[model samples]
Target: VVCEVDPELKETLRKFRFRKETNNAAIIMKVDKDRQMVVLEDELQNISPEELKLELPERQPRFVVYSYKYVHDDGRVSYPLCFIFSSPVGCKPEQQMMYAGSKNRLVQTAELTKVFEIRTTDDLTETWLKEKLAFFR
Candidate 1:
């Protein structure tokens, strides 16, 4: 399962991967099509409580990625991430479409029988990613 990204985004991702782990860490991010930029955000530092979150923009992002870095109580770590890419023209029921594609890619690429979209630490237990990736071994 391959994700087709713009050459611009590909370069950004490569740079992100090589940065210090702290700089690379993010709970979620969005791709700005008009600006051709990737904006990564930390949940605690960047977002307010869900109830206090801001209204959506008139122009929605073209791509989004949610990342969970599983850090075990004992200190092991792994990353299990999901992504959403919008069609150039967009669609109705946007979340349903984004989630379906994101979930499918996560399962296929990780060799997992199932993939759960998560929003909390429990859902991203440290061993979970290891278990999923273990299937290919």
Candidate 2:
């Protein structure tokens, strides 16, 4: 099923993309199954990956836009905006399919490049993120 992107959510993503100030920020989103639309769930700032993990529901699917403060090996600093789809192992199959169908549409609306996914929230940590970013280095 094709899900529609919420207009307010689209504006939020647009501002997030071009904001001049930088910090560790993240936006959590979930699909409103009945409405067939993606909506904002939560917005976080200066949050640690460990803390972010705790904010997600253990058995549900979610989409996260994390602006990470990445420090390179040579000391260069950058905030790479990342898209994370959290589809846990035991999610309801129907919900899983809905989330899967809407994933790319959300990514395109966010206009993000650093995409990633996790089967468990436990893997949503600094170590795992750095490992993924290593490929871009």
| Highest-scoring model, lDDT | 2
**TM-score for all models, in order of appearance:** 0.36, 0.96
User: 1-137 in candidate 1: lDDT tens per residue?
Assistant: 22333445444544543444531132233433354334443222222223112311223323333244545568876543433232322333453344334444433433333233333323233354446544423
Residue 90 displacement (Å), model 2: 1.5
Count residue pairs with overlapping backbones in model 1. 0
lDDT of 1 at 111: 36
- TM-score of candidate 1 to 2 decimals: 0.36
lDDT per model vs. reference: 0.36, 0.89
Give one digit per residue, the lDDT tens place, for model 2 in 39-130: 99998988878888999888999999988889988999988888999999889889888999999999999988889999988889899998
Q: Top TM-score: which candidate number?
A: 2
Could you tell me which residue pairs clash in candidate 2?
none
Error of 2 at 3 (Å): 0.8
Q: Candidate 1: where is the Cα deviation over 4 Å? A: 1-4, 27-62, 79-91, 94-137
TM-score of 2: 0.96
